[PDB]
Amino acid sequence: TQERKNQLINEFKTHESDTGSPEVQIAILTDSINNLNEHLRTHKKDHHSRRGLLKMVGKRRNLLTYLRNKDVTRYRELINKLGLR
Amino acid sequence: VMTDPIADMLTRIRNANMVRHEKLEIPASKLKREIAEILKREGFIRDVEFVEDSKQGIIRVFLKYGQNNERVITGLKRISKPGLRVYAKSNEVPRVLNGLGIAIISTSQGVLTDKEARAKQAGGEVLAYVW
Amino acid sequence: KVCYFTSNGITHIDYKDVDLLKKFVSERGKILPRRVTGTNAKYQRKLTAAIKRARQMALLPYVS
Amino acid sequence: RIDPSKLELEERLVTVNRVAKVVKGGRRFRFAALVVVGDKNGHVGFGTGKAQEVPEAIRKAVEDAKKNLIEVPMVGTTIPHEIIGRFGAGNILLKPASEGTGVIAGGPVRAVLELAGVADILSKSLGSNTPINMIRATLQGLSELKRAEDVAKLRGKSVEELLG
Amino acid sequence: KYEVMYIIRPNIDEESKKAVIERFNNVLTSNGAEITGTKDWGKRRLAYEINDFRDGFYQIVNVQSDAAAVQEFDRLAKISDDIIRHIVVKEE
Amino acid sequence: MSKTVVRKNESLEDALRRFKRSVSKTGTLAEARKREFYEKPSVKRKKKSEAARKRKF
RNA sequence: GGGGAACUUGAGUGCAGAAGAGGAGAGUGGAAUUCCACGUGUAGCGGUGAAAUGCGUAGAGAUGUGGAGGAACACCAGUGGCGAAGGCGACUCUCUGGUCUGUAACUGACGCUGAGGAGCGAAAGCGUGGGGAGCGAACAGGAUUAGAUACCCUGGUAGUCCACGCCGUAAACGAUGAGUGCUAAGUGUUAGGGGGUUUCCGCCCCUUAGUGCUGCAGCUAACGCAUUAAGCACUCCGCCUG
RNA sequence: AAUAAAUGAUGCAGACAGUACUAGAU
């Protein structure tokens, strides 16, 4: 912790202090969901973590829809960069 | 969310009347300013003032009690709700309590009361009643 | 009454404090209640944790 | 304010219900009297009374109603505006009518409106048909009425400025 | 940061106690766990009885590892008869 | 049982006087006397909120 | 309503901290029950309103030592805490979810609800393989009763536990759907923040979210609710029509 | 020299009707 977030921020920062950055939030949610699935592949019975992952995925989907409705160029760029297929 | 500013404005005013308060604070939208000025010129309110601040702007309303203990605005009620819109024509413009009250109606040419709309031969959203 | 941790401004109990845990635990060994010890809820929870760890590390008895 | 009872009144009863109180010996029967007292010039009142006899209960109800009179506007022999009373699950609406319609209401509301001096009113009960609650809701609706001149004085405007 | 405290059986000579201490320290450093602090309370009377002893030697060690030498120390102490009790706690 | 503390140079009932008073601060009267028959978890939990607050004991 | 351009109060990210029985996984624990072995030791032990069935002279119970195994975690414990709900209470550790505090730096409406659908889901129950200390449906026996296929007592299978899967029901209740705004007060309480003297200990005031009691207006058929509404209003969903 | 207040768990009691019953007036 405190390394993956900083790296993703430095990578997806459009401005010097751009931290809202729907793209940054999406990247953070993606990495968190991946880290969560890493341990869910073993502790299959942790349903509360599954609910948290569902919440994160809902946030991700809402952000993706907003970005697509706002700027399709940046939406496609984020797609090509992250591979969120 | 809140789904509408106007209905909450009217209900806040109604609660203020019930409690016999003297002031209020509202985000003061343009239509709210218009309704407040209409009520002012209609004698329902003592005085109204606008407070344009940085956040959004605020408006203060001073409830009126002309006599010992009497509520000028006995009751309010909204009609054109967000989901059931009401549009009235010039010939169907209603009158509140045989012309005793007043109902606000946004028309093709500015926001006007029932009598003003009847005189100008217009119609539109019946967005509130007053008794 | 008056609490001890607040009066002393102390920090994490540092369960090693066998004398403090002793004087805060009943003579029999049972954990004294909050209404008698005068401590706050947070300090009482930390006290329970510390006394349990101590009992686990043979620093205080289970039965007497 | 309280209206004085020194006026000519057309006291008229509505119903007399017989109640019973249970005791070791048995049921004790008492009579409950409902009466509406008022004049046809815009003043009326409601009262009730209880006693082991019919005439005594009637007298008590009349005496109580005398102390509970109320004034009602008489704009054009009718009401200035429509209104509804909602006293205790009893909903009754009252609409103004033309000069030739007449009083239209169920027994108690009709009696109250007649004894009040109003001749042309449209009514309809939308709740329980209990006479006590009917009378209470009618009285409440009549009390919540407002006069044109009173409203003009209150809102700092002229009568014509409101009527047109 | 992590903290480690364990108890050694009393019937052990000083040289054997030191040898066991160095053995467990080497075990901890098997991954590079720096020993940031050590403390030896010495001979203390246990509040309650254990397998065969009423007293023992208390040993404290401060460590900053990756939770692997921790498990090594745990499985070694649980097996070795030199140590009787032990617990690892986070100093956070 | 009151405690392991010994007292001598008193009467026979002087010891019982302090026995019956010191036995209150031990579970001999509550912990070892309540568990004579089972209590369901619900009533088990409600019993504390009732007694420890109402001060019926 | 659609399209275009700006804004932060709504919404969310970060910054420094805070609590919690939040979940899954691994290890550890000492009281207490049962059994076993041994030393001391006799005539009873256990039990009911009373009694008996039961165990005991092949030596019981009790006492003392040691071992074996299985479930739960006393005191702390408190309408205290967490969780969306069921629910979660010993200790240590690995992997993890959400929440609150000042947010103002950041994007600038990205928000609420949600038919259908998916997932989760007390206890009981079922299937596979283990395990079984106590408790204990069915069952056997001993009592009471006119009768007792019960309430009491003695034993006691499945079950209660573990890994996987299935079932998807409860008074699953606060018998009160989710979100937002407004609407007197006193009152304890949890985790925080700011201040008025004090380095403090501590007193007071203010301000956040949650948890409890009494109470104005208001609502209600009454009971009662009352800033955590069942008050005053808006949006969406499920349900009701002797 | 003084001197203490206790202790509490009670076993049994099954049924009663089909059709019946009071009013009061300005």
DSSP string, B1-15: --S-SHHHHHHHHHH
Q: Which residues pair with B61 in a beta bridge?
A: B48
Report resolution in angstroms: 5.1
Give the residue on E whose Cα is nearest the Cα of C29.
E47
Q: How far is CA E71 from CA E2, E30, E35, E76, in A?
A: 12, 12, 16, 8
DSSP H or E stretch at residue A67: helix A47-70
Residues, chain A, total? Answer: 85
The answer to whether the Cβ–Cβ distance between C59 and E47 falls below 8 Å is yes
> Does the C-beta of F8 come within 7 A of strand H?
no
Residues 6+ apart with CB under 8 A from C9: none
Kindly list the partner chains of chain D, i.e. chains with 3 or more CB atom pairs below 8 Å: B
3-class DSSP state of A18: coil
> Are E57 and E10 spatial neighbours (Cβ–Cβ below 8 Å)?
yes
Q: In Å, how far from its chain's centre is CA E38?
A: 10
B104 CA from G65 C1′ (Å): 97
CA distances from residue B70 to D87, D155, D158, E81 in whole angstroms, order as listed: 21, 11, 19, 91
Nucleotides of G under 7 A from a protein CB: 8-15, 19-25, 27-32, 67, 74-80, 83-85, 90-98, 105-112, 119-121, 135, 164-165, 179-184, 189-192, 200-202, 217-218, 220-222, 231-236
The number of C-beta contacts closer than 8 angstroms across C and E is 23
DSSP B95: -
Distance D6 CA to G126 C1' (A): 88
Cα D146 to chain centroid distance, Å, stands at 16
Subunit contact B66:D154, Cβ cutoff 8 A = yes
Nearest to E87 among C56, C60, C63 (CB): C56
**CA nearest to D136, candidates D112, D102, D115:** D112
- Decide: CB of F17 under 7 A of nucleic strand H: yes
Count of Cβ atoms closer than 10 Å to residue A82 Cβ: 14
Q: Is C1 on the interface with F (CB under 8 A)?
A: no
Closest partner residue to D154 among B72, B99, B115, by Cβ?
Answer: B72
The whole-angstrom separation of Cα B80 and Cα D17 is 47
How far apart, in whole angstroms, are the C-alpha atoms of residue A44 and residue F23? 51
- Residue D34 distance to chain B (closest CA, Å): 32
Residue D75, CB, strand H, below 7 Å: no
Q: Between the CA of D86 and the C1' of G220, what is the distance in angstroms?
A: 12
With CA atoms as reference, report the closest residue to D77 among D40, D106, D45.
Answer: D40
B100, D148 Cβ separation under 8 angstroms: yes
